[PDB]
Nucleic acid binder design. Sequence first.
RNA 1: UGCAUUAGCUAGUUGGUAAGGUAACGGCUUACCAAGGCAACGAUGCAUAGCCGACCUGAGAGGGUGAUCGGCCACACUGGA
RNA 2: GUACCUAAUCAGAAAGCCACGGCUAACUACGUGCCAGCAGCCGCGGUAAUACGUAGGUGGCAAGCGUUAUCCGGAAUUAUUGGGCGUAAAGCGCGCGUAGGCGGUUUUUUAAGUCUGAUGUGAAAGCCCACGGCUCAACCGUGGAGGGUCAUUGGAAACUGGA
RNA 3: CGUAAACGAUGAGUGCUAAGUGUUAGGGGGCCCCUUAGUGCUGCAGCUAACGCAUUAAGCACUCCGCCUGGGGAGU
Lengths: 131, 74, 134, 156, 199
Amino acid sequence: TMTDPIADMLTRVRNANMVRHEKLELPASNIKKEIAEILKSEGFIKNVEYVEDDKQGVLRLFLKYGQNDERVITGLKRISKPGLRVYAKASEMPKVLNGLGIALVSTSEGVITDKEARKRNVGGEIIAYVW
Amino acid sequence: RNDRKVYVGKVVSDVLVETYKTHKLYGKRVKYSKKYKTHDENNSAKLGDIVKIQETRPLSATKRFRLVEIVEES
Amino acid sequence: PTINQLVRKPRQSKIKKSDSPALNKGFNSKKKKFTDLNSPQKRGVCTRVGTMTPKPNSALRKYARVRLSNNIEINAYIPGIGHNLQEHSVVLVRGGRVKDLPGVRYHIVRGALDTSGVDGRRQGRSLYGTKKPK
Amino acid sequence: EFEERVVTINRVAKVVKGGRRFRFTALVVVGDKNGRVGFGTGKAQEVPEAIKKAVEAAKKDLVVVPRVEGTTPHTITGRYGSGSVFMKPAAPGTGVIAGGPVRAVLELAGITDILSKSLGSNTPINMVRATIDGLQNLKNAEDVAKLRGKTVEELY
Amino acid sequence: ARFRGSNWKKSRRLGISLSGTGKELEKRPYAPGQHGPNQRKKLSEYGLQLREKQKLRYLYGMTERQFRNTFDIAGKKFGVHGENFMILLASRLDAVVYSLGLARTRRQARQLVNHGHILVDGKRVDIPSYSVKPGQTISVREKSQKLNIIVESVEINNFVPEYLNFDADSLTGTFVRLPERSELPAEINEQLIVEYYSR
RNA sequence: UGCAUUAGCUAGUUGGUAAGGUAACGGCUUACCAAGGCAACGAUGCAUAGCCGACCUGAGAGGGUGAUCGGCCACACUGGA
RNA sequence: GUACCUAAUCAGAAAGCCACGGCUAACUACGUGCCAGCAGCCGCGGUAAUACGUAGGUGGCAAGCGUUAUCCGGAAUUAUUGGGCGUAAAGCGCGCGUAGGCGGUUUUUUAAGUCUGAUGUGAAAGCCCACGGCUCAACCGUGGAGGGUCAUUGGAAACUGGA
RNA sequence: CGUAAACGAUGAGUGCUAAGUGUUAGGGGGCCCCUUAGUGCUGCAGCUAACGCAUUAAGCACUCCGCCUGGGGAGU
Ligand SMILES: [Mg+2]
Ligand SMILES: [Mg+2]
Ligand SMILES: [Mg+2]
Ligand SMILES: [Mg+2]
Ligand SMILES: [Mg+2]
Ligand SMILES: [Mg+2]
Ligand SMILES: [Mg+2]
Ligand SMILES: [Mg+2]
Ligand SMILES: [Mg+2]
Ligand SMILES: [Mg+2]
Ligand SMILES: [Mg+2]
Ligand SMILES: [Mg+2]
Ligand SMILES: [Mg+2]
Ligand SMILES: [Mg+2]
Ligand SMILES: [Mg+2]
Ligand SMILES: [Mg+2]
Ligand SMILES: [Mg+2]
Ligand SMILES: [Mg+2]
Ligand SMILES: [Mg+2]
Ligand SMILES: [Mg+2]
Ligand SMILES: [Mg+2]
Ligand SMILES: [Mg+2]
């Protein structure tokens, strides 16, 4: 059955991005909402809408493509996994693509990026790399 | 004064103190348990109760702990 | 495999094997047992010198049968043109198998113990136990 | 202009009713050492004629290699078929740490400082194609800042 | 010195004037030996990095063991490794004595140091590999200030480099500051030598 | 540290009481009472090994070694006091 | 009477080892004729051998140079970093199911994992950086840094775990 | 007894990713349109050493299990 809803979200984005879809819908959760907003804030996706329903909510994402239909998102990668959880300290926060990408980190001050985690001197669970 | 080590566990014979041993190479946490033969005084606790224990001087060939408090009844 | 499978059954590297097994064993005479020591050479006695034919190649390759100091029997190649060896000769044996000769895994050291140096050698003499002329 | 280097010369054969018919395959990398590199192949019974064909074909697929002060903007692994080449930015003092046909491609691109490892097939054509693949997927900060809609400072 | 063979043969093989003048590659700018006139093929990648190393090594007249040890010493300081290596070689008391002009050839500058004719900061230094620091003073011992080798070399006032200061009347030199890659020989592509020690 | 082509081990054994004993707690020893204790998280058996700081190698993750110097242990022809 | 220093005399006592077909820097001649031999691999030698032996020349090192043995590397060739399983080695013939591993959404709570400080400790020597003494260098000395899955203690609460 | 080329030579679970066209068992709406679950063929993206696979993946992902580490010796 479903074991990693976050990796399912990152893969839904990867598959939709591969075929250059305009948008995609997925069932919602709090961390998936916060992951999506960071992608919006960092400029990887266009917009996030939340659609309420009886079951668990729906997240609508809008993908971004530049001139000549070049993909803004190049890749997504799940780092921490149910089979093997990955944690890091602020002093060992990984840089993604030499700083040209981002790492999503779940810290005790919420879900933030790696550049901000070093700024706040907090570590936590490395959710995913986006570049 | 000084502090003696304290554990919490479940009686398996009338104490199991299951802990995690992170794998040296792969980083995955693996559950492991160790049985702590302890001194219950007036046979008060019973099987399945969750109990608190404290370290003491040797009391017998294998008993090094005293049952201080019962936490969750069987 | 999965991380859990690796935790249950960790990786195992292939065990390396030695090309000169007769050199890496000793013998304690008092306890009549075999040791493991990794010697670079071993002394031995020639049981049977002679010749053997190669496996495309064709020649009469000179060799000796040697009982080493650890009571192991080996076939050792005699390099160079001419040798002074015969039965009951005391030889020093080093590693290095000779291709085209099946069952010969060792070399006799020229110029050590009873083996003489190659006669008339003038180039690469230290490989054939020959003193410097003149 | 463009300098060229002969990576590999291979004599190939096709069998006919008689004996064997032989030709020569030349794999050549061309580059200007100023951020434009390209590879091509040519086949002929004569080695020099195969080289000229390979040189001419190389000029039709030149690639633009992003660089920062003589080094790549980030780590990348280029993969083509069984070939796979790991490329990492190195400090200016470091030279081109590369093994084979990778060195020809990176040098003619104008790298002079890189840490590269060939993890895969050592067949030169596929090693060369893997190297070009990795350089084809490098992105400079000014380009990715444009797509994300931020300025370069906000990327950090 | 250490290598006491023909420096003419070495300069012809390496394609670099060891004397710094060019009289060795004068009539026969081709490798020594029987197959000299017969022109050989190209040099491999290994054969190009190796020939660069021998160019430097035979210029400063050092054995390979000492040469590699200096390379490791130079690779620990901040900066570009290959350039730090060239700077360190130029700071040898072997090469400072020659660069100042106290000897005609680099081999003569070696025998002067080795035989104890040279002082550094007022005290005798017998070691040709001595690594002179900026600010140091190199002079000639009193019993040797009037020797024909030193006298004849000094009167041919050559281009004493700008990282050195010499006073011919005083027979005394000053190591002003560390050289720069432009003041050091340009016929050596030191990037090849760094690659040579990477494989 | 290997070996499951080693799966059962233990009967002072595991706990209790008392006495004795020790610098000292204690099955450390004995007497009586009870039937516990260990083990697939590998008991037990066999084989191998003194352990560590360090040392060699490696980009690192790792892999390999314990001569020399220092810490700890054990032993002194073999075994018992 | 050692180190060291001073004076006198003499280039006079003081260079060898391996390699040179490709990998791999460096080639010619003669002898030999699948012999004698060489060989880490590819392989070389059966009458015009740059691979055998010698000679001249050359290359690499040098008071050393080669060989053997052993360990790590190259080896992503046990792959956590960092591999695979249609046909190359590799999906149990197929169910049911125990332990274990893993597990959907939200709120409150906790604080074992996680994160972040404090304190103690991780001897000395060693490695690395800096400086000083040895004519230099080895080496020696001094001052730092590093090395814990360490412990104790104060905070945080997103994620994993507990309620 | 417990083995077969016991084969799709393709472990199970879950989700996501162009189309076209047959067929089996249903459902909804106006013979056609939509929709479930099977079973076939063709074919993008992607993957592959190639052959090919391609919503019944050999694509993109997460969880668990089984298995591999040159050939012969020897499934001895
Ligand atoms: Mg022993
Ligand atoms: Mg490695
Ligand atoms: Mg050559
Ligand atoms: Mg030979
Ligand atoms: Mg001939
Ligand atoms: Mg040869
Ligand atoms: Mg020869
Ligand atoms: Mg020496
Ligand atoms: Mg090895
Ligand atoms: Mg290896
Ligand atoms: Mg493989
Ligand atoms: Mg599989
Ligand atoms: Mg088959
Ligand atoms: Mg098969
Ligand atoms: Mg099956
Ligand atoms: Mg079967
Ligand atoms: Mg010293
Ligand atoms: Mg099968
Ligand atoms: Mg599947
Ligand atoms: Mg699927
Ligand atoms: Mg198809
Ligand atoms: Mg269907």
